[PDB]
Design an enzyme around this catalytic site. Structure first.
Site, PDB file in Angstrom:
ATOM      1  CD  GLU A 163      -3.010  -0.901   2.404  1.00 36.02           C
ATOM      2  OE1 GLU A 163      -2.944   0.196   2.983  1.00 36.02           O
ATOM      3  OE2 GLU A 163      -3.914  -1.734   2.652  1.00 36.02           O
ATOM      4  CD  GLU A 371      -3.285  -5.745   3.968  1.00 36.55           C
ATOM      5  OE1 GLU A 371      -2.045  -5.531   4.008  1.00 36.55           O
ATOM      6  OE2 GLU A 371      -4.123  -4.952   4.452  1.00 36.55           O
ATOM      7  CD1 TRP A 423      -1.410  -0.096  10.491  1.00 39.70           C
ATOM      8  CD2 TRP A 423       0.633  -0.078  11.426  1.00 39.70           C
ATOM      9  NE1 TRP A 423      -0.611  -0.967   9.781  1.00 39.70           N
ATOM     10  CE2 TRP A 423       0.643  -0.974  10.335  1.00 39.70           C
ATOM     11  CE3 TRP A 423       1.816   0.103  12.159  1.00 39.70           C
ATOM     12  CZ2 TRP A 423       1.795  -1.694   9.964  1.00 39.70           C
ATOM     13  CZ3 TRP A 423       2.957  -0.612  11.792  1.00 39.70           C
ATOM     14  CH2 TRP A 423       2.934  -1.500  10.705  1.00 39.70           C
TER      15      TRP A 423
END
Ligand SMILES: *[C@@H]1O[C@H](CO)[C@@H](O[C@@H]2O[C@H](CO)[C@@H](O)[C@H](O)[C@H]2NC(C)=O)[C@H](O)[C@H]1NC(C)=O
EC number: 3.2.1.21
Length: 459
Positions: A163, A371, A423
Site C-alpha cells: 500500500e 488484503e 497502528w
C-alpha cells in the site's frame, strides 16, 4: 472459487513480530514513533511484543495449518534483516528466522507471499529523508536485491511495497504514521514519486537478476476504496467520484501497469492549483522520459487491498486551499444506512465493482486480493457471527466477479491471521481470524468462529 484458487491470510512484521531489539535488530520507525508517546497510538501502546510472532512462530504455523491455507502472506523486517538499512551489516538471526517460516510453510504445502516493506522503514533510512529523498530508491533496490537473493530460491510470489498509496498519505501527507509531520498537499506526491521509482527498479532488479533462475512473480499492492457518486445522475459527482479513483489508485497503477506516467487529470489539476499560492513548480513531481521507460509494465500481477466504499460529491476548491489531495475538489462520506466499525463501512458489492474496474482499466490482469477484512472492537469476539456474515457476502460477490464478470482473480487473502498492533489503533481493533490475548506473556491463539468457518470455504 475456480482453478486451483489461492486462499490465504496476511500478517505484517511490525504488527505481529515483537523482538523489536532482539538479536541484533535495528530500530525501525514505529519503534521510535510508539516509544515517543503523546497520544499518537491508542493508550501509548507499542509493538514491542505484539503477537510475539518472532518467538512463537510455530503457534502461527499451527493456525495456518488449522485453516488449511493454500498460501500465507507475511512481510520481512527491513531493520531485522539489515539493522542500519544497508547490506553493510547483515543479521544472520533475522535470516534464520524468515528462512524457518518459509521452510515450514513449504513442508506443509503452503505457498509463501512475501512483502519486502510494510510501513516500516529502518530509523537510519528515515533520518536521511525517508521516502522524501531519492537516495531511498537505491536503498530499497539494494534491500530488495538482498531479499531476492536470500529467500528467492524458494519464494516465488512477492509484494515489494505494501500500500504505497496509504503509505505516502499517512507517513508524509497526513503526518499520522511516522515520521509524523503533517505536510498537507506536498508530502504524499513527493513520497509517491520515490515509492514508484523504487518499486520500479526493484522489479527490474528481479527481472534482470533473479527471474531467469528463480521464476517468480513480483508486484506491489494498492489500497482501493471503491467510490460511488453521492447523488447519482447528478453529473458533477459522477466525474468527481471517477477522478477520486484516479487520484488514489491510478496515481500509482497507471504509471506502473500502463504508459509509465501519472494520470492526465492528476497532472493538470495539481499543476493548475499549484500556481495557486505561487509554488514555483507543480507539487506533482515529473517523471523524465527516461524514467517512463523504466517504470512501465513493471508489475507481474495486480494486487489490491480492499476494505470499503465511500460516497463522493464534487466540491469546488473555491478559494484554492492546500492539497490534502482532497482539494482535487472532492469530499467523501458514507451512505447513512451502512454498518461501520471505525473506518471500514461494510459495503461488499464494492469489491465486485472494483474488480471489473481493474479488469476494464488494466487489460484483464491477473489479480490478487492481498488484503481484505473486517475488525471488531475490544470485546465482541469468538462467536463472531455478525462479522462472519460480512465475510460471506464479500465472497459471494467475489464469486459473481469471476463468473458473471470474468475477472482473472487468483488469490483471496484475508487481512489477518491474528489480532495484532493496528497502528494508531493499537490492540483496540482486532482483524484476526484468530483471537490473541495481549495480557498473558504467552500469546495464545484461539480461533474465531470465522477461523473455523473460513476453513470450510477453503472447499
Ligand atoms: C501517553 O503517554 C504520554 C507521554 O508521552 C502521556 O503524557 C502525559 O500526560 C499527562 C496527562 O494525561 C501529563 O501529566 C504528563 O506530564 C505527560 N507525560 C509526560 C512526561 O510528558 C499521556 O498521558 C499518555 N496517555 C495515555 C492515555 O496513556
Amino acid at each position: 472459487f475456480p482453478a486451483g484458487f489461492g486462499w490465504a491470510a496476511a500478517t505484517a512484521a511490525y504488527q505481529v513480530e515483537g523482538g523489536w531489539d532482539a538479536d541484533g535488530k535495528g530500530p525501525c520507525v514505529w519503534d521510535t514513533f510508539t516509544h515517543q508517546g503523546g497520544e499518537r497510538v491508542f493508550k501509548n501502546q507499542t509493538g514491542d511484543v505484539a503477537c510475539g510472532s518472532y518467538t512463537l512462530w510455530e503457534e502461527d504455523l499451527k493456525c495456518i495449518k488449522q485453516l488449511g491455507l493454500t498460501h500465507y502472506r507475511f512481510s520481512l523486517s527491513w531493520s531485522r534483516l539489515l539493522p542500519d538499512g544497508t547490506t553493510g551489516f547483515i543479521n544472520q538471526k533475522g535470516i534464520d528466522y524468515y528462512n524457518k517460516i518459509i521452510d515450514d510453510l513449504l513442508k506443509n504445502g503452503v505457498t509463501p507471499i512475501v512483502t519486502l516493506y510494510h510501513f516500516d522503514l529502518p530509523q537510519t533510512l528515515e533520518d536521511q529523508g525517508g521516502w522524501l529523498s531519492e537516495a531511498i530508491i537505491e536503498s530499497f533496490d539494494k534491500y530488495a536485491q538482498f531479499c531476492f537473493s536470500t529467500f528467492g530460491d524458494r519464494v516465488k510470489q512477492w509484494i515489494t511495497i505494501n500500500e504505497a498509496n496509504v503509505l505516502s498519505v499517512m507517513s508524509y501527507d497526513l503526518g499520522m504514521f511516522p515520521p509524523g509531520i503533517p505536510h498537507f498537499g506536498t508530502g504524499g506526491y513527493q513520497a509517491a514519486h520515490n515509492l514508484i521509482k523504487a518499486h520500479a527498479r526493484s522489479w527490474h532488479s528481479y527481472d534482470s537478476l533473479f527471474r531467469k533462475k528463480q521464476k517468480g512473480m513480483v508486484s506491489l499492492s494498492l489500497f482501493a476504496v471503491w467510490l460511488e457518486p453521492a447523488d447519482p445522475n447528478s453529473v458533477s459527482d459522477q466525474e468527481a467520484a471517477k477522478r477520486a479513483i484516479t487520484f488514489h489508485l491510478d496515481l500509482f497503477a497507471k504509471p506502473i501497469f500502463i504508459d509509465g506516467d501519472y494520470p492526465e487529470v492528476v497532472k493538470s489539476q495539481i499543476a493548475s492549483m499549484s500556481q495557486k499560492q505561487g509554488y514555483p513548480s507543480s507539487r506533482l513531481p515529473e517523471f523524465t522520459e527516461e524514467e517512463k521507460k523504466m517504470i512501465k509494465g513493471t508489475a507481474d500481477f495486480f494486487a489490491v487491498q480492499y476494505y470499503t466504499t465511500r460516497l463522493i460529491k464534487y466540491q469546488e476548491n473555491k478559494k484554492g486551499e492546500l492539497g490534502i489531495l482532497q482539494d482535487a475538489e472532492i469530499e467523501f462520506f458514507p451512505d447513512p444506512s451502512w454498518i461501520n466499525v471505525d473506518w471500514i463501512y461494510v459495503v461488499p458489492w464494492g469489491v465486485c465493482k472494483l474488480l471489473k474496474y481493474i479488469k476494464d482499466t488494466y487489460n484483464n490482469p491477473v489479480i490478487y486480493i492481498t488484503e481484505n477484512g473486517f475488525p471488531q472492537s475490544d470485546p465482541a469476539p469468538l462467536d463472531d457471527t455478525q462479522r462472519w456474515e460480512y465475510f460471506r457476502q464479500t465472497f459471494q460477490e467475489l464469486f459473481k466477479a469471476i463468473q458473471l464478470d470474468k475477472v482473472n482473480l487468483q488469490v483471496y487473502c484475508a487481512w489477518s491471521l491474528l489480532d495484532n498492533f493496528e497502528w494508531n489503533q493499537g490492540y483496540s481493533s482486532r482483524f484476526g481470524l484468530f483471537h490473541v490475548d495481549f495480557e498473558d506473556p504467552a500469546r495464545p491463539r484461539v480461533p474465531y468462529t470465522s477461523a473455523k468457518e473460513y476453513a470450510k470455504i477453503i472447499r
